């Protein structure tokens with residue numbers, strides 16, 4: 122019953138409960154004449170919520186906050202963006218105006234500035250070298266190395282064995298690469314290997330776009346990235 126791109130009007134946001142205190146949020150956006158889905162994460166931290174990634178733009182992110190209040194009724198106090206593209210930081214200004222403390226790595230913040238995208242206020246330290254991990258409340262943040270972008274982070278929820286791979290991980294229905302202008306193709310499979318080695322216990326894997334699955338999404342993504350490498 123996971124909502125797919127064809128079910129969600131641009132401007133609407135859906136929530137999908139994965140476990141006690143863990144949801145994904147799903148939105149859609151138009152770009153270059155097509156419509157794409159996008160995922161983020163919501164993790165309960167006591168009586169507050171941690172948000173992972175925006176809903177791709179100001180209008181979607183405003184709807185996201187309204188759906189959170191309607192369906193959960195707890196305040197979003199912190200948000201983390203997992204890389205610098207608009208499906209991760211677009212809407213950060215909406216979050217900040219709502220009193221959310223927005224976070225990203227120094228690398229993400231610099232790349233967002235250069236690209237002209239919205240810049241999360243706070244900086245996540247300790248994530249600059251491949252294999253680095255830091256705790257952030259109810260989650261662990263992990264920098265696996267360059268992949269979809271040089272700055273992409275992954276997020277693990279240990280209480281629920283949920284691994285949020287972000288745009289470094291592809292859904293199964295994507296059999297060809299897309300939006301890889303900022304990627305490091307040569308290192309992407311190695312970065313995926315670091316994820317597998319660090320979170321081999323993950324049970325639920327959430328890509329940046331599309332349907333969740335298991336750790337086989339990591340093998341799937343390696344297959345697709347290597348095929349694009351050899352195009």
Ligand SMILES: Cc1cccc2c(-c3ccccc3Cl)c(C(=O)O)[nH]c12
Pocket residue numbers: 152157158206207208269288295298299300329330
């Ligand atoms: C920043 C941006 C804009 C428009 C599309 C995308 C995709 C995408 C996602 C699903 C399938 C095909 C594509 Cl091109 C990604 C991504 O793969 O992370 N980012 C995007």
Ligand SMILES: [Zn+2]
Pocket residue numbers: 204206269270288300
């Ligand atoms: Zn991206």
Ligand SMILES: [Zn+2]
Pocket residue numbers: 206208288329330
């Ligand atoms: Zn993406």
Ligand SMILES: [Zn+2]
Pocket residue numbers: 293340341342344
């Ligand atoms: Zn596959």
